[PDB]
Design a protein around this ligand. Structure first.
Ligand SMILES: COc1cc(C)c(CNC[C@@H](NC(=O)c2cc(C)on2)c2ccccc2)cc1C
Ligand SMILES: COc1cc(C)c(CNC[C@@H](NC(=O)c2cc(C)on2)c2ccccc2)cc1C
Lengths: 451, 449
């Protein structure tokens, strides 16, 4: 995280005169020479979802043509208002918008976190104005994204995290028993980030309808994969607006939508639901201020990359892309299930979590780390995951992963008490008082802003 | 664009050629670019130079995959962010704080304002026992304060201004309660471009032991240099002990690409209340310095590139140009007695009239090609001067168009054409109606027909 200490001149103060552009560019391209092989060659779990040179180059030029655009001035850039409205319209359609009576509306945001915070804040504001709730509560599974905790703390919503079943899918009974007259929303993930499992969405959406509460499908990860997994012959239940009780769905264009980082979509079943997301200031000397998302000034150029990506790919592009990923996933799962010292948690389609009842998975992960792998460290239970992308569908990437894993297992199988590098860090963290995890994370964030 | 371009309400079956998509975006670009390139737009675009944009777009291209949530993959971007903070903190007299000044890179001024609000709320709850937070801001303070207030559940007490459109500190002193967690001042405020009495506000804040956030979103990259050039600017940054947090935008006058700002806290004890930490999540340990998870790291590299390419001499020259251009603009405006400048702003000029309908004067300018901001309470229009306004004859043209605008309205005092009666209605309308028309506008914006 800090390897450019000696390599390049640091800057704690603005230089008196301006440094040449060639020089500035020379540094960035040199860091890109060190950093791009990790993602380009397929060693990172998620992080970069497309990664083709011509696709990246395509979206860079897209960015360049629209680099000055800011949606806060639709008068000046009506193209960006077109791009945003058109991204929303298309995403909505792909997530059963027609089924919901053509009332599905939404806005383009910065990321899945924004989408989840905005949905969480909307249900709060909606339930206070229409249900009278002043002490909101949200029932979500333990596997639901960390952002649910963010929204809770921020918006003063009580978050009730409910257990999972033997398949790591949400326990609807536990969800039902958690519902009180103050529950404003219940959520399910399509799929979750931890183990890549699609929660039982039809049963969650029916539960929300029965109590007259909201149902949010966090499809930030599978929004642009599951519609195409369905059409390919893979087991995927209806998870979107085709379900009567589903009131909002988030899906990330910057993830498997293959857009530049900095874009997501938040969808609501009806406009009356959407209007509660907005903030309107009527008495400010600065004029009438109306904002649909968290931010005022928005990078318009990134809405254009989301639009460009969807249009460049089309339904055929997504089917191809999804098939490649699920076949890489089929092959990867087959190999892990062929090393009986390791187990896959639940039955994921492409975000594969691997744990071990016989050995220290953290050390296994470290062995892979030494081979160049950038895997996601997981706890509760201690495991690691591989979120497969188009970067892992490239020639011999899954074969390299499988080879490196057979070796990784063997090394730990030969030295069960081995804990090198990051392995004793994950081990101390998995069983640590929350305040210790608080003091270290704080220290780590501080470590990133040092000069 | 209704029929100008083909609508896309559904994904096409097969993907459209990449060359085809670019051509459509470039078509839309070419119709939209002259409006800001010829300096007709007040603010919105702050640098606008072809060679700078090309430089910054090459920087984007090299860091496009960058996502700061993965510092292990992009250590380049953790360096850029740390460095954008450091350089900013130093420019805003963070050295006077004794090197304790720290901060983070954000998506814009709104996120920086919201973050500070959430932070003072959390800080005050943890350390003072405040469960009903209250915040005191002048009425001139940004609308993001109201957004921040509704989101985090902080009572926002908006205080009146003085005859010079600066904050009435006495009004703010009488607004402070034991539930007040923070005060704010704008350097400058968006409406009338004036700098609030920040020393007096920080002195009030320090006296009460509550935070003081300075909204330097618009002026953080202009005011340090206005001072160096001898212009009168009240000390507004970390030079003042009472100032506990300062927010500034690199995407505005910092000349970095859109989607970046910086929030600075005087102490790390304060900054730590901004961070989000999750410990029991099956997905691992999750930490986030700001609101976001994933972020476009490429935008942080552009702020780092811009800053280093300009340095002190660059920002001084850029500011010299803008302030001189504004000196000329205020002089010309002052020479049209039917109009008045609200307060004494350095470069964000707000012109209003007690004789003619300013909304009609503004309508006349729109007709000539000028993109100006509508302001109510009082009715007025503002011009945020940028580098595009420093180009030859831009200011001269504005004043010719403005002299003509005043000539017309003076002849026809009942004239209410184009957007002029829309603004007129909105300044007179009840809040419930303003809420409804604005909601319909957001819906309008997201319509596919
Ligand atoms: C009630 O009728 C309205 C409604 C509106 C919205 C307006 C325009 N105000 C201008 C306002 N921009 C928006 O709020 C905005 C955001 C998005 C997206 O699109 N526009 C604004 C600009 C800069 C700084 C502060 C505010 C004017 C009348 C008469
Ligand atoms: C020192 O204790 C820590 C502390 C941390 C933060 C970590 C990394 N967890 C991985 C975690 N990334 C961060 O939260 C993050 C944010 C920034 C900036 O940088 N990293 C994560 C990301 C995405 C999805 C799920 C999880 C590991 C140990 C051992």
């Amino acid at each position: 995280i800090k390897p450019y200490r000696d390599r390049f001149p640091s800057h704690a103060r603005l230089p008196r005169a301006g440094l040449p552009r060639a020089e500035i560019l020379a540094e960035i391209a040199a860091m890109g020479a060190a950093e791009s092989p990790a993602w380009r060659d397929g060693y990172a779990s998620g992080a970069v979802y497309h990664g083709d040179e011509h696709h990246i180059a395509f979206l860079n030029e897209v960015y360049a043509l629209q680099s000055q655009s800011n949606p806060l001035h639709p008068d000046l850039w009506p193209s960006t208002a077109k791009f945003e409205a058109e991204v929303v319209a298309m995403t909505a359609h792909m997530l059963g918008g027609d089924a919901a009576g053509g009332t599905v509306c939404g806005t383009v945001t910065s990321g899945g976190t924004e989408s989840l915070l905005l949905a969480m804040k909307t249900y709060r504001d909606w339930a206070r104005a229409t249900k009278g709730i002043t002490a909101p509560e949200a029932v979500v599974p333990v596997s639901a994204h960390a952002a649910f905790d963010k929204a809770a703390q921020y918006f003063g919503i009580k978050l009730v995290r409910t257990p999972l079943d033997a398949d790591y899918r949400a326990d609807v009974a536990a969800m039902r028993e958690a519902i009180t007259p103050n529950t404003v929303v219940v959520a399910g993930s399509a799929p979750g980030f931890p183990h890549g499992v699609v929660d039982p969405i039809p049963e969650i959406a029916a539960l929300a309808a029965e109590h007259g509460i909201g149902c949010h499908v966090d499809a930030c990860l599978g929004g642009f994969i599951l519609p195409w997994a369905e059409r390919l012959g893979y087991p995927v239940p209806p998870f979107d607006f085709r379900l009567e009780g589903v009131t909002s769905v988030s899906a990330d264009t910057h993830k498997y939508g293959y857009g530049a980082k900095g874009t997501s979509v938040i969808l609501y079943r009806r406009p009356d639901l959407l209007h509660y997301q907005y903030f309107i200031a009527a008495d400010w000397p600065g004029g009438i201020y109306a904002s649909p998302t968290f931010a005022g000034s928005r990078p318009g150029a990134l809405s254009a990359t989301a639009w460009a990506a969807m249009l460049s790919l089309g339904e055929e592009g997504y089917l191809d892309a999804t098939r490649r990923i699920l076949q890489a996933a089929d092959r990867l799962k087959a190999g892990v299930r062929a090393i009986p010292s390791l187990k896959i948690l639940g039955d994921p389609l492409w975000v594969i979590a691997v744990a071990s009842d016989e050995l220290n998975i953290y050390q296994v992960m470290e062995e892979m780390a030494g081979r160049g792998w950038r895997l996601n460290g997981l706890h509760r239970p201690p495991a690691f995951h591989v979120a497969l992308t188009l970067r892992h569908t490239e020639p011999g990437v899954v074969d390299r992963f499988l080879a490196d894993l057979q070796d990784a297992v063997a090394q730990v199988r030969a030295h069960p008490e081995k804990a090198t590098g990051m392995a004793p860090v994950y081990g101390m963290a998995a069983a640590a008082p929350p305040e210790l995890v608080r003091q270290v994370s704080t220290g780590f964030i501080d470590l990133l802003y040092e000069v």
